[PDB]
Amino acid sequence: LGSMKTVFSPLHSRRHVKTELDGGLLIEPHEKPSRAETILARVKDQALGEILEPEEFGLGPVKRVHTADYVSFLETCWDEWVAAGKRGEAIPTFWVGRGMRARLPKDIDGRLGYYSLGADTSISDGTWEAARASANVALTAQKLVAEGERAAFALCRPPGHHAHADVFGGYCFFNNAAIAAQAFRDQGYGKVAVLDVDFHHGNGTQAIFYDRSDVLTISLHGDPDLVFPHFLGFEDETGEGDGEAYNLNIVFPPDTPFSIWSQGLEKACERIRTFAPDALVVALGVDTFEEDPISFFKLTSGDYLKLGKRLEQLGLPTVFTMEGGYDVDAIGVNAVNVMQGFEGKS
Amino acid sequence: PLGSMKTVFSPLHSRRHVKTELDGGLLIEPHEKPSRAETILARVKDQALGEILEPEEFGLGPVKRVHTADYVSFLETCWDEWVAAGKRGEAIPTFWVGRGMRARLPKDIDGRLGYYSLGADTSISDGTWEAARASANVALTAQKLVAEGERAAFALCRPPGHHAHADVFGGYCFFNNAAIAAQAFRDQGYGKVAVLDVDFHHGNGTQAIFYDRSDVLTISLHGDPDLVFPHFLGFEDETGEGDGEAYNLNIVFPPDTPFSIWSQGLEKACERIRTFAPDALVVALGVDTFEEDPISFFKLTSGDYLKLGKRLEQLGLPTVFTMEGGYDVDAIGVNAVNVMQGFEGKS
Ligand SMILES: NCCCNCCCCCS
Ligand SMILES: NCCCNCCCCCS
């Protein structure tokens, strides 16, 4: 069996929010620190490969994807919120409704709404530090692969694939997969593919590269007619301008099992083959699991070994970025199964 | 003796009685509470302002002259769909059409909730549909009273309406009562209508509804949206579009603005109404301009509302007043009724 290195930062635990808006109530958040700790423990248990901490790349590579005003806002948001006298965690209350102007206001409540797409992603002390560490985790995995590793596992937390150039949400702040893909491009890789196997549509990644033909973006996901993110992810979204034909969405209905999901995976792999990229980023979520509380697919733990094996057969330099997966008990087995299948297990 | 003004009030407003409002990251007791309407009604009775009438039922026809059919359907079914989907809190949006996403109506109730909203502070629960319907009938009954010969009528609406677009709810508003009354004037043959929004917040819904039209002049005085709700409309450069260019007027004020400066804006609005020469006037009346209001930063005094009502009467127009905001429940009755009493000649 092969080996794969994992990048992990203990600084993820700086993000430890207490509240998530869900069904009209404030609940304990789904995207909790134990997710990364459970995955880490399985990486060690299975001796997957070397575990390393990230290097500090600074904001340069983050700002190749995200706007400067957005990066500034994420660093100051919590200070601005506390200073304005709010007593809860930072949660948007108002946003740019249909018919309103996409215009950045001065007030923190208006700024919060301008930069968000949902109210379930509370911001509090340590969110900036954790988001910075997570992007460095992704950049460190990309450096490992650029320097010669076939693949590397970026154990990111918070996840990234829902963040736009200048919008946070879906538990995401910096788009780690897009940051890694752009780093490949800046280092001379002519074409990069990003494949999103998380249950939810990678709307941030789609938006970031939507008018570009040098980065192919593909996502398999639950039908947004029915699930988050609702307002992107449909199969008719194929790109715009030079990017037309360089975005591919593959949608599935409730209770979809691996036997059908893997048919979409095969279509994605055929699209990657014709694109013929120089590097692959896989935005990996295991909320496709049959026990996941906020998804409706029916993948089993053994199916992740099959997924990893199929991804290896693409024969590409591959960075895996950790996205979702919210049955905390099974998240380690399921995520590491993808890496182990990539390395030849089962 | 003062003149008399009839008030329309529906006991059905108390069907809207939500338990939660998102505020500052917490779920708090809602500001827009039933005691607001009961405190105003009590003052109307105590001051013997005039006859108090219950509304007539107009149906959804006049509502759909302003609001889209799909939005009206959504508001009727939202609570039933929410409960059927197994949610345990009140109906509050969690996700919406972010910048860069598609304005596309989805099937799921969370998606529809976000599609049709501009904020998460406006919980929906059982009775919200019924209360919003009755509130629109209150505005239409006041409009009918004026069209049948009354100089003015006070529509004691709850919930308020001026933040609702043709197909967006928010800011405690569901049906835009002021816009519905204005459109009723137009449909009845009044050639030109002015809607004057003196609530502390921008009447963004009213502006949006009539934004490409010149037959309805919309004017709002309000706190600077750089600083306060609704944040993304209400700026002075928003003057209308298409055939409505120059028929929307936003007058913006900064924190701590007193009546001595606010009334300069009111004179500007009155001059714009004069040149427009409308056949009827709807006043979207909020008294959250009051110095003690917790949701606002202007400094009007109770006596200033007498002056406001007097000045509005001097426009010489058939006038419907629709109740909007005002959240210091203690003085909301004095302040709102002072506008009507000042209009009828009090001090
Ligand atoms: N309380 C809202 C639950 C849904 N949250 C959005 C889905 C996030 C997927 C992240 S991979
Ligand atoms: N919890 C948010 C408080 C702000 N709510 C918007 C202001 C509504 C006044 C409209 S008349």
Ligand SMILES: [K+]
């Ligand atoms: K996906």
Ligand SMILES: [K+]
């Ligand atoms: K693309």
Ligand SMILES: [K+]
């Ligand atoms: K106003």
Ligand SMILES: [K+]
């Ligand atoms: K207009």
Ligand SMILES: [Mg+2]
């Ligand atoms: Mg504010």
Ligand SMILES: [Mg+2]
């Ligand atoms: Mg849903």
Ligand SMILES: [Zn+2]
């Ligand atoms: Zn997910």
Ligand SMILES: [Zn+2]
């Ligand atoms: Zn108001």
